[PDB]
Design an enzyme around this catalytic site. Structure first.
Site, PDB file in Angstrom:
ATOM      1  N   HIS A 185       0.801  -1.223   0.000  1.00  0.00           N
ATOM      2  CA  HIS A 185       0.000   0.000   0.000  1.00  0.00           C
ATOM      3  C   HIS A 185       0.840   1.284   0.000  1.00  0.00           C
ATOM      4  CE1 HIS A 185       0.916  -0.967   4.176  1.00  0.00           C
ATOM      5  NE2 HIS A 185       0.696   0.299   4.490  1.00  0.00           N
ATOM      6  N   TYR A 197       0.064  -4.681  -9.948  1.00  0.00           N
ATOM      7  CA  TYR A 197      -0.583  -5.529  -8.970  1.00  0.00           C
ATOM      8  C   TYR A 197      -0.793  -6.885  -9.616  1.00  0.00           C
ATOM      9  CZ  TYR A 197      -1.655  -1.149  -6.666  1.00  0.00           C
ATOM     10  OH  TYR A 197      -1.579   0.068  -6.044  1.00  0.00           O
ATOM     11  N   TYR A 227      -2.796   2.599 -10.728  1.00  0.00           N
ATOM     12  CA  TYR A 227      -3.902   2.315  -9.827  1.00  0.00           C
ATOM     13  C   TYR A 227      -5.131   1.821 -10.584  1.00  0.00           C
ATOM     14  CZ  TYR A 227      -1.441   4.519  -5.910  1.00  0.00           C
ATOM     15  OH  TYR A 227      -0.559   4.832  -4.914  1.00  0.00           O
TER      16      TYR A 227
HETATM   17  C1  LIG Z   1      -5.445   2.003  -5.273  1.00  0.00           C
HETATM   18  C2  LIG Z   1      -4.013   1.996  -4.790  1.00  0.00           C
HETATM   19  C3  LIG Z   1      -3.970   1.773  -3.281  1.00  0.00           C
HETATM   20  C4  LIG Z   1      -2.657   2.214  -2.644  1.00  0.00           C
HETATM   21  C5  LIG Z   1      -2.526   3.731  -2.605  1.00  0.00           C
HETATM   22  C6  LIG Z   1      -1.936   4.180  -1.272  1.00  0.00           C
HETATM   23  N1  LIG Z   1      -1.364   5.542  -1.305  1.00  0.00           N
HETATM   24  C7  LIG Z   1       0.095   5.451  -1.514  1.00  0.00           C
HETATM   25  C8  LIG Z   1       0.828   5.557  -0.177  1.00  0.00           C
HETATM   26  C9  LIG Z   1       0.960   7.000   0.319  1.00  0.00           C
HETATM   27  N2  LIG Z   1       2.011   7.687  -0.428  1.00  0.00           N
HETATM   28  C10 LIG Z   1       1.266   7.040   1.799  1.00  0.00           C
HETATM   29  O1  LIG Z   1       2.311   7.602   2.179  1.00  0.00           O
HETATM   30  O2  LIG Z   1       0.468   6.518   2.607  1.00  0.00           O
HETATM   31  C11 LIG Z   1      -1.994   6.377  -2.345  1.00  0.00           C
HETATM   32  C12 LIG Z   1      -2.012   7.795  -1.786  1.00  0.00           C
HETATM   33  O3  LIG Z   1      -0.724   8.391  -1.978  1.00  0.00           O
HETATM   34  C13 LIG Z   1      -0.839   9.648  -2.633  1.00  0.00           C
HETATM   35  N3  LIG Z   1      -0.387   9.438  -4.027  1.00  0.00           N
HETATM   36  C14 LIG Z   1      -0.188   8.252  -4.631  1.00  0.00           C
HETATM   37  N4  LIG Z   1       0.270   8.411  -5.900  1.00  0.00           N
HETATM   38  C15 LIG Z   1       0.383   9.734  -6.119  1.00  0.00           C
HETATM   39  C16 LIG Z   1       0.802  10.599  -7.245  1.00  0.00           C
HETATM   40  N5  LIG Z   1       1.206  10.083  -8.427  1.00  0.00           N
HETATM   41  N6  LIG Z   1       0.764  11.928  -7.058  1.00  0.00           N
HETATM   42  C17 LIG Z   1       0.363  12.465  -5.894  1.00  0.00           C
HETATM   43  N7  LIG Z   1      -0.029  11.751  -4.829  1.00  0.00           N
HETATM   44  C18 LIG Z   1      -0.038  10.402  -4.880  1.00  0.00           C
HETATM   45  C19 LIG Z   1      -2.296  10.046  -2.522  1.00  0.00           C
HETATM   46  O4  LIG Z   1      -2.430  10.850  -1.334  1.00  0.00           O
HETATM   47  C20 LIG Z   1      -3.028   8.720  -2.432  1.00  0.00           C
HETATM   48  O5  LIG Z   1      -4.199   8.816  -1.610  1.00  0.00           O
END
Ligand SMILES: CCCCCCN(CC[C@H](N)C(=O)O)C[C@H]1O[C@@H](n2cnc3c(N)ncnc32)[C@H](O)[C@@H]1O
Length: 246
Positions: A185, A197, A227
């Site tokens: 995650h 995934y 995602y």
């Molecule tokens: C469906 C996939 C499930 C897993 C996703 C979990 N989180 C990633 C972990 C997150 N960076 C953390 O520190 O818990 C996704 C969150 O990270 C940020 N994030 C992820 N990718 C990003 C991107 N390319 N640009 C900006 N923000 C992003 C956003 O706040 C998401 O809610």
């Protein structure tokens, strides 16, 4: 009498993901014993110990040193790290939230993401080939209805597992200091990912998803994954999406 004279069998069950169960089976052909093992997809990292019908009762961290005619020789890793089948439910994420997966620990770590304002990300410890299982996406198991019917501010950690089940890593478990049993995650989103995934059958976590590389990755490269929202989706995504055609 008047005839010449003279004076046991190992079984391997491989999963599609590359992991495997191995040991001698009982009279009924079930993986039951105290010399049964699960072998991670690297075919060296192992959980050896007590199993009933393939279900891990007490797996001790181990290394598969060699194989001779299908018979594996295991050697215990140092320590007291033991693992058991601990499938999550809709409210219990793990019985030992702070017990890391030993295979994952050799391959990834969590640091601040290189993508700005993405938060934390997942990174490799190792240069590896394509199609390498790197990390595991475990969490609670809630239905598609519960997920779909609530705000997007609750779905930042939800990953559909199949037709029946969504996996989530809800507060406070999004903090590594409260939950580090699996780290899938922590992978952020790229429209140009180096991982996907994929399905995975884990001896501790049950049926879940993993992060598997699409190609070669360097030691310390950030691991990203598409995602795959429908084209609705969180703002940053919708924004990153439009800001990509160029
Ligand atoms: C469906 C996939 C499930 C897993 C996703 C979990 N989180 C990633 C972990 C997150 N960076 C953390 O520190 O818990 C996704 C969150 O990270 C940020 N994030 C992820 N990718 C990003 C991107 N390319 N640009 C900006 N923000 C992003 C956003 O706040 C998401 O809610």
């Amino acid at each position: 009498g008047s005839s010449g004279s003279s004076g046991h069998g190992v079984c391997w069950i491989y999963y599609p993901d590359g992991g495997s169960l191995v040991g001698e089976v009982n009279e009924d052909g079930e993986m039951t014993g105290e010399k049964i093992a699960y072998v991670y997809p690297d075919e060296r990292t192992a959980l050896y110990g007590k199993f009933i019908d393939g279900e891990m009762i007490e797996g001790k961290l181990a290394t598969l040193m060699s194989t001779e005619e299908g018979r594996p020789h295991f050697e215990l890793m140092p320590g007291n790290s033991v693992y058991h089948f601990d499938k999550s439910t809709s409210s219990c994420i793990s019985t030992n939230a702070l017990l890391p997966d030993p295979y994952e620990s050799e391959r990834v770590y969590v640091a601040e993401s290189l993508i700005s304002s993405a938060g934390e990300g997942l990174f490799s410890k190792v240069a590896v080939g394509p199609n390498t299982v790197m990390s595991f996406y475990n969490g609670v198991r809630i239905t598609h209805q519960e997920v779909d019917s609530r705000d997007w501010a609750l779905n930042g950690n939800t990953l559909s597992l199949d037709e029946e089940t969504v996996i989530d890593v809800p507060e406070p478990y999004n903090h590594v200091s409260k939950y580090c049993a699996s780290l899938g995650h922590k992978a952020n989103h790229s429209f140009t990912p180096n991982c996907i995934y994929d399905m995975f059958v884990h001896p501790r976590f049950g049926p879940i998803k993993c992060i598997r590389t699409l190609r070669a990755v360097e030691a310390d490269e950030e691991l990203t994954v598409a995602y795959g929202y429908d084209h609705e989706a969180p703002e940053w995504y919708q924004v990153e999406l439009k800001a990509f055609q160029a």
